[PDB]
Every structure is written in C-alpha cells, then in structure tokens.
Design a protein around this ligand. Structure first.
Ligand SMILES: *[C@@H]1O[C@H](CO)[C@@H](O)[C@H](O)[C@H]1NC(C)=O
Ligand SMILES: *[C@@H]1O[C@H](CO)[C@@H](O)[C@H](O)[C@H]1NC(C)=O
Ligand SMILES: *[C@@H]1O[C@H](CO)[C@@H](O)[C@H](O)[C@H]1NC(C)=O
Ligand SMILES: *[C@@H]1O[C@H](CO)[C@@H](O)[C@H](O)[C@H]1NC(C)=O
Ligand SMILES: [Ca+2]
Ligand SMILES: [Ca+2]
Ligand SMILES: [Ca+2]
Lengths: 380, 335, 100
C-alpha cells in the first residue's frame, strides 16, 4: 500500500504469501519470480523447508514425446512429517493418501483436500503451504506459502528471500548457472538422467504450427484483448513465450495453448484482477466437456455449495485460495451425496448422518423438526 | 557425380535414402522427409504428405522451408511464402520451374527437388550437409546399414522408422498405418527380371544394385497392373544419378511415352538442350543424364516461337521484343 | 411402420502395440474396414477399453488415449511415461430400422 504524500509515494508492504508454480510441465516461476525452463525427466524436489523435513513438495516431470524437451507434469507428491505422510495428486485427478486411493474432500491431521471446481484440486495444510493443482487442460501446479517461511526454503522454487540472484543457490553454497544445471542437483533419484539445456525452438519446425500458435498466443499481448487489463500489472512477455513454446512443441496444441492462457489468467487473478470472458472462439471445448448438471464459471472464489454443507457446515469452506475458474454447480443449486445437481428443495437435511428428506416433519427426542429448503429446524 | 547425395520417394510408399537403403512405409500424413537437424541453425526443412488417388499412393503436398522461404507445392500449384506464383519463378539463389515432366525447385548450394506431381519426389543435397540431416532420407553419413534404424541402441523397423519422423498438423491426429500382410504374385512372367536385368541397364548393374528394386517391382505387380513402371523409372533415375548412362528401356507397351511432333522421348539425353537462342549450350555442360523429351542431334530446339526443333539455319532471331523470321533484316540508323 | 432396432458389437483387438517410441495401438475404422472387420457406416456410441485389464476404466489408467465415435482408438508410445502403451480394443454400436 502506497500513500501519496511528501511529494512522493510512501509505500509500506502488506504481508504477501509467496507463490511458486510449474506451468506447461516445463516452465517454473519460483518464489523470487525467477522464471526458468526445465526439460527434465525425474522427480524433483519442488520445494522444501531445508532446515527441517517439515514438508517436502515433490513434482514428477515426465517426457511426453519424441523430443527430449517434450515434458508433462505427472504427479505432485507432498511428503510430510519427514515422509510419514504422502499426499500424491496424479494427473488424472486421482488422489493417493499414503499410497491409498482417497476421494475428495478429506479433512484430517489439519490437511484439507477438496476440488473448488472440476479443473483444480486444493491441498491445504496447517504447516503453512497450500497446493493448488490444475488438471484441465493439463497438469500444472501452484504453491502458496505464508510469508513466515521467507528466506528459509530450498528446492526448485528457490529460498523465498526476495532476491533473484540467489535462486540458484545449490546445497554446495554457489549460485548455479542455468536452469537445467540447477535442477540436476535436486533430482529425487540418483538414477535419473540429467536435464539438458534447450536452444532449439520447436516453433521453427512446422509452418502450420507456426501460424496456429502465433494467431492464437498473440491474444495475450493484444491491447484490445481481455488480457489487457493485466498488462499494466504483469508483463505478459514470459507468458507469451510460454504459449509459443508450448503450442509449437505440444502434440495437443490446443491443450498446451489453453493451459498457457489459463496460466496467465490465474497468475493475474492471483495478483488481484478478474479476467473474464477470454475464451472467445478459443478453448470452448473446455466449456462443453463439463460433467452433466454442472456448468462453467469464470470466478469460482469459494468452496463448492453442497447439501451436506448447508445442512451441517463444513471444514472445507474455511480455506482462502485464489479465485480459480472451472466447472461447478450454478448458484441456487447444490450437489447431493449422489453428486447430481438439484435445487435446495430437492436435497435433504442431514441429522446424525441420517438422510432426512426435504419438507418432512419428524419427531426426535421429544422435539419436532422440519426440513425446509434443505435447512434443518427443530422445536421443543 | 551425385553418388550419395540423393534420396527419393516413389510408387507404393517406397523410400530410398541417401546411403542406398530402400524400404516401404505406407504412411498417410505429413513426415519430415529431410531437415538440417544437427546444426546450430537449420538450412532446409522438406516434408511430404502422402495420400491416395482412389487407390494409387501419391504425394498430396510438399512443404520446403529454407532460409526464410516457404514453398508449398500441392494441387498442381506452387505457393511461395503464401502467394501463388506462375512457373517459372526465379530469385537470387532459388528457381522453381515446370521443367520437363516434373516441378523442380533448385536452391543453389542447398538442394534440388524434383516432383513429378503424382508419385515421385527426389532430393539432391549438397555434400556439406553430411551427417547433419535427419529424416526419411536418412543421415547422409555414408553408412547405409548401421545407423538409420538404431534409436537408443535399439534396431527398429521401416514402420517404426517412418513413424518416428512424423509431424501432425496443428489440429490433426493422424493414425499410424498398420503392417500389411504377406505378399503374393512375385515376378511370375519375369518382366522385372527381363527389363531390370536387361541390356538397358547393363552398366547400371555396376553402380546401383537392383535387389530392392526387384522386390519393389514385384510388390507393385501385386498392385495394379497399370502401375508397375514406377520402380523401373526410379532405377533409371538412380543409375543416371550415380553417374552411369541408362539406355532406352521403353517400348510401345512398357509404359510408353509421347512427345511433340519433332520431339522424341529419350532416357539419358543431355539435360542442357541446345536451343538456337543459345545453340551451343550443350558445349561444356556438367550435369548427368536426364530423362525427357529432346531433339535429334544436329537440329536444336526453337524456344523463340515454340515451333519444335528446327535446323540451325531456319530458326528465328530476336531484337528488342521483336521476333524476326529467317530472311528478315532490320537496319538501325548506324547499322 | 418402422422402428429403430439397435445393438452393440463385439470386441475388436486388431493389433498388438509395439515396444519403442513410435509404437502403440492404432485401431482405426479405416483399418477395421481394410482388415475385414465389419464397420457400420452409422453409429451412436462406441466403447474403448484395455484388453488385458477388462475391469479398470480408461480414466483410471491415466494414459494418453484418444477414442472417439468418428475415428476409433489411438495410443502412442511416446506420449506416456514409460514410453509404452497397453493392448487396447473397442466395440461399436449399430442401429438399423426394421418395419413394425
Ligand atoms: C493438527 O496438528 C496437531 C499437531 O501435529 C495435531 O496434534 C492435531 O491432531 C491436528 N489436528 C487438529 C484438528 O488439530
Ligand atoms: C486442384 O485445383 C483445381 C483448381 O485449381 C481444382 O479444380 C482441383 O479439384 C484440385 N485438385 C486436383 C486433384 O486437381
Ligand atoms: C557422423 O555423426 C556421428 C554421430 O555422432 C559422429 O559420431 C561421427 O563422428 C560423424 N562423422 C562424420 C565424418 O561426420
Ligand atoms: C531497311 O530495312 C527495310 C526492311 O527490310 C527495307 O525495306 C529498307 O530498304 C532497308 N533500308 C535500306 C536497305 O537502306
Ligand atoms: Ca531467492
Ligand atoms: Ca547412415
Ligand atoms: Ca489392439
């Protein structure tokens, strides 16, 4: 916050949770905002409070094509309590709690897992870090840190100390030179192959890939585009480079293209701008592919409205996360335990875990109760 | 001559690499036919898309990218940097023509691309791109049998090799063609053995081995019996390119050719047709045999008014956009 | 009168995916026609699955397979890690119109 005084701007800082991210399966934006490319095939320690083993976010990046520089993120393995717990979010959406399938939501040991929409999974922990993982159109990861851990972390996302020249500090006490040379010090398994520096732009290969990627990714830097509202805040040049590189290199050009556009939108919305309606004539197959009875939404900024939640509250909705977009039930509707989207009148109040049907007067413990609009009331 | 700097695509998905390997890969989409891919900066990127005319395997589009110039040949038309052009189109270093029976794109010090427009397509590359290329045309290192089909130390097969060098469109997911079942037919009447081993290619046996060509001839014989001569023509091209002098194997039945009235179809005629615009062009030429239409020796071609081949003494002259018949004179104020 | 009569087909496993980078399974309607498998010109919906794992669905696999009613099924080795595919197959739905 900056006040206009003394002929200048008097600027103080509100505390800011740091934000790491891995987008396109290759690009990494650290806590110091040192964007760098990583074409590797191993499990890399994405972030770790390298004083202790309190938490350890791991990311498994896997080569996805003929070219050595064709990568996709494939998993996010939050190790915890020194490896005692491991929450592994795969790329299909499957969530493994201690290598066991666990549907969503789940709330235990202060850890809360839930899907704000069909595109994202939120792994909120009390240790300080929050993971927000994207599955649609492909796999991307975002990490938020309570600024208390400033200047303490290690790993790929850098030590979070407001210095871009120290981000490549390795465990040997020197700043590494380039991205891949730095990453190959943080591999999980000694048997992995070292990442290699990539100069050859895949954009130069196919002229049709060229024109496609150009004509679409140029929507970023267009001053009349929906994205212009964030131009005066976030410089879109790295995002445009990401979109170019992805779409040219991606076998599913639309998937990586829309992943890049979603990444730009989500970063800007993290900075506090609500970019909306940017999918004009583009990425609409992600409008349509929604699960039945759900619908798209551009500003999903809370939990998912559920019949159980409106009946008996929910731990889920007590987590603050950047407003992501995706598929959710529309307002005025709720999804029952069956998952289908019905209005409040069609979903039941739940007492002691008992399905108590809507608009139904019942007797319990010398009391008379009613289930009006999914809301439970008791008298006497 | 053009010993090992040639590759070609002919007939039923037959690919001949730089170092002499022949195989069959029945793809049906775009593939990186050749590309400068072992250098700091690419020089050429030639790709083909192979499709069907009813049943005949054909090339439906070629895209040659080179040094900032994009050339897309398809639908009997040529696109230069996105604009249609009328053949021939010539610029510093590049010249594209409807020469002979084909469309030829020559980029000086880079490449020579012949494309009959239906099936065949042949690349000549400079020697300087040795070992720095990769594609269906091979590695251009000179060793045929050891380095093409060994990816990550694993020896692989024509289907695998032709599928590795794949490239989809921006919004296209082309499948991979499945292996074709066993063969039949073979060379029963011996036509492939009668012709290929015949006198026409005697010294060609000393240069280019016909075993793969024999097999391809038999395989085409399994295909339509109006399309067996592609392998023969390709063998003639290869024999010419290695340096040898092929002989006229054609007969009024063996895929006969037709040429204009004064003009004859020859195998291995001089590529530089003497034309009384430059009636002694063929004097100190350096270019191997070329198949096509020609003129009988002694009478040069007439390119001034396109009257066929005329004797050296009866063909017109030209002055300032004016064409002068023989016997005509024009007097300037000084001469 | 005329009423639509429709039914599923059987399972079609016309290929065994090949190890390597270019390998995989390419089960296409054109290949089905060429190999002699009956291909209905018109259809409503089709179902793909892994032939060797007949229980766990496609999305539980997590591998990159594209399987559509207009084309068929395709799994490419290079797109997965490890760079391999499973042995898939698929079935189609054929509907005709029979007089009542
Ligand atoms: C949260 O963490 C503390 C410390 O590990 C633990 O004792 C507690 O059981 C966890 N859950 C809750 C609901 O506090
Ligand atoms: C080629 O272009 C012409 C028009 O220039 C068009 O009529 C024709 O259908 C195209 N295709 C073929 C195979 O000739
Ligand atoms: C050709 O390329 C191979 C591939 O690495 C290399 O080992 C060899 O030294 C090269 N030789 C020549 C003559 O270019
Ligand atoms: C110049 O040429 C014309 C055309 O043949 C001719 O008629 C004329 O007589 C010539 N002039 C002379 C011969 O001085
Ligand atoms: Ca730092
Ligand atoms: Ca070789
Ligand atoms: Ca199969």
């Amino acid at each position: 916050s900056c006040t206009c005084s003394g002929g200048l701007w008097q600027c103080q800082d509100l505390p800011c949770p740091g934000t790491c991210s891995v987008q396109g399966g290759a690009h990494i934006s650290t806590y110091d905002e040192k964007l760098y490319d990583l074409h590797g095939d191993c499990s890399y320690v994405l972030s770790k409070k390298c004083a202790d083993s309190s938490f350890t976010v791991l990311a498994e990046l896997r080569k996805c094509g003929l070219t050595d520089n064709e990568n996709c993120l494939k998993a996010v393995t939050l190790s915890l309590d020194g490896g005692d717990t491991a929450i592994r979010v795969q790329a299909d959406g499957g969530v493994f709690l201690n290598s066991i399938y666990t549907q969503l939501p789940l709330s235990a040991a202060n850890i809360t897992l839930f899907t704000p929409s069909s595109f994202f999974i939120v792994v909120q922990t009390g240790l300080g870090l929050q993971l927000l993982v994207q599955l649609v159109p492909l796999m991307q990861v975002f990490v938020r840190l309570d600024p208390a851990h400033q200047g303490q972390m290690c790993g790929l996302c850098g030590n979070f100390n407001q210095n871009q020249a120290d981000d490549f500090t390795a465990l040997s006490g020197v700043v590494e030179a380039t991205g891949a040379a730095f990453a190959n010090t943080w591999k999980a398994q000694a048997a992995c192959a070292n990442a290699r520096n990539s100069f050859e732009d895949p954009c130069s290969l196919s002229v049709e890939n060229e024109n496609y990627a150009r004509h679409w990714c140029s929507r970023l830097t267009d001053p009349n585009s929906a994205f212009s509202r964030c131009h005066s805040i976030i410089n879109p040049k790295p995002f445009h480079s990401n979109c170019m590189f992805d779409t040219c290199n991606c076998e599913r050009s639309e998937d990586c293209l829309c992943a890049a556009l979603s990444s730009y939108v989500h970063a800007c919305a993290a900075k506090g701008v609500q970019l909306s309606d940017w999918r004009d004539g583009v990425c609409t197959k992600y409008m349509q592919n929604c699960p039945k009875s759900q619908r798209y939404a551009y500003v999903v900024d809370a939990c998912q409205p559920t019949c159980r939640g409106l009946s008996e509250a929910d731990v889920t909705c007590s987590v603050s996360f950047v407003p992501v977009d995706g598929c959710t039930c529309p307002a005025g509707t709720f999804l029952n335990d069956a998952g289908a989207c019905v209005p409040a009148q069609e979903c039941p109040c739940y007492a002691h875990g008992t399905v108590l049907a809507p608009g139904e007067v019942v007797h319990d413990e010398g009391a008379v109760c009613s289930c009006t609009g999914g809301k439970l009331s008791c008298l006497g | 001559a053009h010993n090992g700097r040639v590759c070609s695509t002919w007939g039923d998905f037959h690919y001949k690499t730089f170092d002499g390997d022949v195989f069959r890969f029945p793809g049906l989409c775009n593939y990186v036919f050749s590309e400068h891919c072992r250098a700091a900066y690419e020089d050429f990127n030639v790709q083909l898309r192979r499709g069907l005319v009813g049943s005949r395997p054909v090339v439906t589009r070629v895209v040659i990218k080179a040094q900032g110039l994009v050339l897309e040949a398809s639908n009997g038309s040529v696109l230069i940097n996105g604009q249609r052009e009328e053949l021939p189109y010539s610029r510093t270093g590049l010249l594209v023509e409807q020469s002979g029976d084909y469309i030829k794109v020559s980029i000086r010090l880079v490449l020579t691309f012949l494309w009959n427009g239906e099936d065949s397509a042949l690349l000549e590359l400079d020697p300087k791109y040795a070992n720095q290329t990769c594609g269906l045309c091979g590695d251009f290192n000179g060793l045929p049998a050891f380095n093409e089909f060994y990816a990550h130390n694993a020896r692989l097969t024509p289907l695998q090799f032709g599928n590795l060098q794949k490239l989809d469109g921006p919004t296209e997911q082309c499948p991979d063609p499945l292996p074709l079942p066993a063969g039949n037919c073979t060379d029963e009447e011996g036509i492939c053995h009668r012709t290929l081993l015949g006198p026409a290619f005697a010294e060609c046996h000393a240069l280019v081995d016909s075993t793969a060509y024999l097999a391809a001839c038999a395989q085409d014989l399994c295909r339509c019996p109006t399309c067996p001569c592609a392998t023969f023509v390709e063998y003639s091209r290869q024999c010419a390119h290695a340096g040898g002098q092929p002989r006229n194997w054609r007969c009024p039945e063996l895929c006969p050719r037709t040429c204009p009235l004064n003009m004859q179809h020859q195998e291995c005629g001089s590529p530089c047709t003497d034309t009384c615009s430059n009636p002694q062009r063929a004097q100190l030429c350096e270019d191997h045999c070329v198949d096509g239409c020609f003129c009988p020796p002694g009478t040069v071609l007439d390119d001034i008014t396109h009257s066929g081949c005329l004797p050296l003494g009866q063909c017109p002259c030209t002055h300032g956009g004016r064409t002068y018949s023989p016997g005509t004179s024009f007097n300037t104020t000084c001469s | 009168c005329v009423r639509e009569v429709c039914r599923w087909s059987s399972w079609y496993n016309g290929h065994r995916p090949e190890p390597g980078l270019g390998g995989g399974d390419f089960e296409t309607f054109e290949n089905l026609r060429q190999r002699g498998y009956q291909v209905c010109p018109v259809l409503a919906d089709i179902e793909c699955r892994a032939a060797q794992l007949p229980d766990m669905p496609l999305e539980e696999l997590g591998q990159q397979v594209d399987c559509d009613r207009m084309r068929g099924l395709m799994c490419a080795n290079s797109q997965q890690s490890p760079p391999l595919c499973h042995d898939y197959e698929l079935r189609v739905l054929c509907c005709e119109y029979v007089p009542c």
